[PDB]
C-alpha cells in the first residue's frame, strides 16, 4: 500500500510525512542499517512473513519496491539527492585509498607536483579534440589531484586543512568578486 | 525533555529514533520550514524540533538535561555540494560566466595550475589552500558548462562517477 524511500546517503533518517505510517507493521529491505529495526518497534525484514502495508527502503531498484510501486502503492520519498553528492562519495574513496595505498600513503605535495602539470595538458588536449567522452575523463583526473592534495594537507603538522576548507576558500573568494 | 535536531541541509528528514516522540505536543524553531509542522498530523512542549544547534531554546533545554536525538554530522566534503550550487547560480546570473565555453576557459586553466605549483614550492599553506580552490573552481566550471551542452551533456556528478570507476581499478 505504501512505499517509503529514504536518502541512501542518510538511510537512518525518514521523511517527516511517513512517521505515522511507520509505527505500524512495516517491512524494511536488507540494505537498511541495523539502526532502523531497533528504532521501529514492530518492523521486520521484507523476506519475512507476508507483505506489510508499508515497506521501508533506500534502494529504488529493489524488487519489492518495483513490485509494490507497479501494483499502485503510494510513494512517500525523501528529497532527491543534490547536484554534487557523488563528490562526497569521491573524497571518502580518496581518504580510504590514502591509508590503504602503499604508494598513495607515502606521496606528498612535491611527489604530486610532477603529475599535475601533465594532467592539465591532457585536459587541454581533450578540449581541443572536441570529444565529450574524454574531456570528462581528464576532468576527473584534475579533480583527483584536488582531492589528493587536500587529503594530504589533513596529515599537515602545521596549519592543516581539509577539502571542506578549500571549498570554503573558493566560495569566500567568489563572494567579494 | 527531548530535543530533536535535524540536518539543516535536509530539514524534512527526522532520525528514526525520534518517531516515538513526535506524537504529542511539539515545538519548532523559526528556521524550520513551514511544511514540517503540517506533516506531523499528530500536532512548554516536552519535544522541541529544530535545525539550529545555536538556537537559545535548544541550548537551554539541552543544558537542562534534555535528551538529544540528532541527525548525523556532515561528512568530509559536504561543503563541495555548496560550491557546486554556488557555481550553478553564477553560471546563470553572471553575464561573463554565462558566455564561457570549454575553449574560452582554456586560458585560465594553465594560469591557475602554474600558480598552484608556485604555491607548492613556496611552502605557504594559505596560498596552497587558495590555489587549490582556484583549480577546483575550473573543474566545477567545466562540469557546469557541460550541463548546458546540446549534444552529450554531463554534470559534476558524472565526472565524480568517472573518477571512482577509474579509482576502483
Ligand atoms: Mg590523464
Ligand atoms: Mg590564482
Residue numbers in the entry:
A (entry chain B): 1 to 177
B (entry chain A): 1 to 43, 51 to 176
Paper lines:
The housecleaning enzyme of Mycobacterium tuberculosis (Mtb), MazG, is a nucleoside triphosphate pyrophosphohydrolase (NTP-PPase) and can hydrolyze all canonical or non-canonical NTPs into NMPs and pyrophosphate. The Mycobacterium tuberculosis MazG (Mtb-MazG) contributes to antibiotic resistance in response to oxidative or nitrosative stress under dormancy, making it a promising target for treating TB in latent infection patients. As a housecleaning enzyme, MazG functions at the cell nucleotide metabolism by degrading the non-canonical NTPs, preventing mutagenesis and DNA damage. Mtb-MazG mainly contains three domains, an extra N-terminal region (NE, residues 1–85) that is absent in other bacterial homologs, the N-terminal domain (NTD, residues 86–253), and the C-terminal domain.
Despite failing in the crystallization of full-length MazG, we succeeded in obtaining the MazG (1–185) protein crystals and solved the 2.7 Å resolution structure using molecular replacement of the AlphaFold2-predicted structure (AF-P96379-F1). There are six MazG molecules in an asymmetrical unit with a cell dimension of 109 × 109 × 242 Å, which includes two monomers and two dimers consisting of two identical chains. The Mtb-MazG (1–185) monomer contained eight α-helices and five β-stands, comprising two globular domains, including a primary three-layered α/β/α sandwich domain (named domain 1) and an entirely α-helices-composed domain (named domain 2). Domain 1 was composed of three α-helices (α1, α2, and α3) and five β-sheet strands (β1, β2, β3, β4, and β5), which was absent in other NTP pyrophosphatases, including B. anthracis, E. coli, and D. radiodurans MazGs. Domain 2 included five α-helices (α4, α5, α6, α7, and α8), which showed a higher B-factor than that in domain 1, indicating this region exhibited more flexibility. In the MazG (1–185) structure, one magnesium ion was present per subunit. The Mg2+ was coordinated by three glutamate residues (Glu119, Glu122, and Glu138) and one aspartate (Asp141). Also, the NTP-PPase activity was significantly lowered for the mutants of E119A, E122A, E138A, and D141A.
